[PDB]
Design an enzyme around this catalytic site. Structure first.
Site, PDB file in Angstrom:
ATOM      1  N   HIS A  60      35.747  42.235  30.101  1.00 50.98           N
ATOM      2  CA  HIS A  60      37.124  43.004  30.172  1.00 50.98           C
ATOM      3  C   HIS A  60      38.401  42.053  29.774  1.00 50.98           C
ATOM      4  CE1 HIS A  60      37.705  41.161  34.062  1.00 50.98           C
ATOM      5  NE2 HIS A  60      36.374  41.020  34.067  1.00 50.98           N
ATOM      6  N   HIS A  63      38.584  34.223  30.347  1.00 50.73           N
ATOM      7  CA  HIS A  63      38.917  33.298  31.536  1.00 50.73           C
ATOM      8  C   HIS A  63      39.029  31.758  30.980  1.00 50.73           C
ATOM      9  CE1 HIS A  63      37.805  36.322  34.860  1.00 50.73           C
ATOM     10  NE2 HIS A  63      38.847  36.539  34.183  1.00 50.73           N
ATOM     11  N   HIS A  90      44.470  33.453  33.202  1.00 49.36           N
ATOM     12  CA  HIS A  90      43.769  34.611  32.170  1.00 49.36           C
ATOM     13  C   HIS A  90      45.203  35.393  31.787  1.00 49.36           C
ATOM     14  CE1 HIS A  90      43.306  36.565  36.078  1.00 49.36           C
ATOM     15  NE2 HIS A  90      44.226  37.631  35.496  1.00 49.36           N
ATOM     16  N   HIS A  92      46.611  39.625  30.600  1.00 48.83           N
ATOM     17  CA  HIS A  92      46.419  41.228  30.664  1.00 48.83           C
ATOM     18  C   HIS A  92      47.199  41.640  29.597  1.00 48.83           C
ATOM     19  CE1 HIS A  92      44.608  41.337  34.657  1.00 48.83           C
ATOM     20  NE2 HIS A  92      45.103  40.363  34.812  1.00 48.83           N
ATOM     21  N   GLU A 102      51.294  43.852  33.767  1.00 53.20           N
ATOM     22  CA  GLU A 102      50.778  44.911  34.958  1.00 53.20           C
ATOM     23  C   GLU A 102      51.842  45.091  36.036  1.00 53.20           C
ATOM     24  OE1 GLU A 102      46.995  42.663  36.333  1.00 53.20           O
ATOM     25  OE2 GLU A 102      46.394  44.791  35.667  1.00 53.20           O
ATOM     26  N   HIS A 115      48.260  35.160  34.461  1.00 51.51           N
ATOM     27  CA  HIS A 115      47.956  35.014  35.804  1.00 51.51           C
ATOM     28  C   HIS A 115      47.252  33.475  35.764  1.00 51.51           C
ATOM     29  CE1 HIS A 115      47.674  39.732  36.502  1.00 51.51           C
ATOM     30  NE2 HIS A 115      49.016  39.033  36.594  1.00 51.51           N
ATOM     31  N   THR A 195      43.997  42.653  41.063  1.00 54.75           N
ATOM     32  CA  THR A 195      44.456  43.716  40.186  1.00 54.75           C
ATOM     33  C   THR A 195      43.349  44.544  39.425  1.00 54.75           C
ATOM     34  OG1 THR A 195      45.275  42.678  38.134  1.00 54.75           O
ATOM     35  CG2 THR A 195      47.004  42.901  40.008  1.00 54.75           C
ATOM     36  N   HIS A 196      42.205  44.271  39.701  1.00 50.46           N
ATOM     37  CA  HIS A 196      41.021  44.808  39.361  1.00 50.46           C
ATOM     38  C   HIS A 196      39.899  44.439  40.538  1.00 50.46           C
ATOM     39  CE1 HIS A 196      39.554  40.849  37.643  1.00 50.46           C
ATOM     40  NE2 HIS A 196      40.853  40.902  37.206  1.00 50.46           N
TER      41      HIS A 196
HETATM   42  N1  AUC Z   1      44.371  36.984  39.188  1.00 44.27           N
HETATM   43  C1  AUC Z   1      43.656  36.417  39.772  1.00 44.27           C
HETATM   44 AU1  AUC Z   1      41.580  36.143  40.518  1.00 44.27          AU
HETATM   45  C2  AUC Z   1      39.913  35.174  41.487  1.00 44.27           C
HETATM   46  N2  AUC Z   1      38.589  35.421  42.144  1.00 44.27           N
HETATM   47 ZN   LIG Z   2      45.171  39.073  36.372  1.00 40.35          ZN
END
Ligand code: AUC
Ligand SMILES: [Zn+2]
Ligand code: AUC
Length: 256
Positions: A60, A63, A90, A92, A102, A115, A195-196
């Site tokens: 998805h 990282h 990472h 988005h 986001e 992030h 956020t997920h």
């Molecule tokens: N954005 C962010 Au995270 C870990 N587990």
């Molecule tokens: Zn994130």
């Protein structure tokens, strides 16, 4: 769980009831309503490039992971009284270059978002433990605006060629993620969540006031990774942003 119609943000509750919690992220930051907090200290980042370890395609998203076995790379200052250990960065993005962050500011959605995640090493034993506690994680979110190419992203873009499909990993070393932050570190902070999934309400958010750039062709590169394992039919990593959630009484404080 994914980001599609079938298992995207609107379905997550069917499985992670916390999705409808009172501390869900991201949120829209209405600058007319943030509260100036004079206790906020400047954020201080001290990262060691030797801590950079690997880049991996998680389907998805992708990282960039760091060795978090000591306090070589830490976040201090801001609203914190203890230091947080850097473990990952990472991105988005959305299906269009124009709308993919986001967090939103005065109802405006940015192109993408970075992030930089850290875990409370002063209070917990490992990220695993820390990840579900209220004070477990500190995440700096940086808003990215489509425009001029950002040469600071180049090393990350190059690495991508090697982790084209799900489950691929590549060594990624000697890299200081602080090279990616804006020049000024003024910020907004609020208590929030992942956020997920699993969506734990374990994050203390540090949203930079200043955005960084990125170009269309750079974003197109993110959008070119595949969610499939190598050898299967191609399925592009089209978008991985979650819609904003109700504030539900929370206060967004500003360090300025
Ligand atoms: N954005 C962010 Au995270 C870990 N587990
Ligand atoms: Zn994130
Ligand atoms: C566990 Au609570 C607003």
């Amino acid at each position: 769980w994914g980001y599609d119609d079938k298992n995207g943000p609107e379905q997550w509750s069917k499985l992670y009831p916390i999705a409808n919690g009172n501390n869900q992220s991201p949120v829209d930051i209405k600058t007319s309503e943030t509260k100036h907090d004079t206790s906020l200290k400047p954020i201080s980042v001290s990262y060691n490039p030797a801590t950079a370890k690997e880049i991996i395609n998680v389907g998805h998203s992708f990282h960039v992971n760091f060795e978090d076995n000591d306090n070589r790379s830490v976040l201090k200052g801001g609203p914190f009284s203890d230091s947080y250990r850097l473990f990952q960065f990472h991105f988005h993005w959305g299906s269009t270059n124009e709308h993919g962050s986001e967090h939103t500011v005065d109802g405006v959605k940015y192109s993408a978002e970075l992030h930089v995640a850290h875990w409370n090493s002063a209070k917990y034993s490992s990220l695993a433990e820390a990840a579900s506690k209220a004070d477990g994680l500190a995440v700096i979110g940086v808003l990215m605006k489509v425009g001029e190419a950002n040469p600071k992203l180049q090393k990350v873009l190059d690495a991508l060629q090697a982790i084209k499909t799900k489950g691929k990993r590549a060594p990624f070393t000697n890299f200081d993620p602080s090279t990616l932050l804006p020049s000024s570190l003024d910020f907004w902070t609020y208590p929030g969540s992942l956020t997920h999934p699993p969506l734990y309400e374990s994050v203390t958010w540090i949203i930079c006031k200043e955005s960084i750039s990125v170009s269309s062709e750079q974003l197109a590169q993110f959008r070119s990774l595949l969610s499939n394992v190598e050898g299967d039919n191609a399925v592009p990593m089209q978008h991985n942003n979650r819609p904003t959630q109700p504030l539900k009484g929370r206060t967004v404080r500003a360090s300025f």
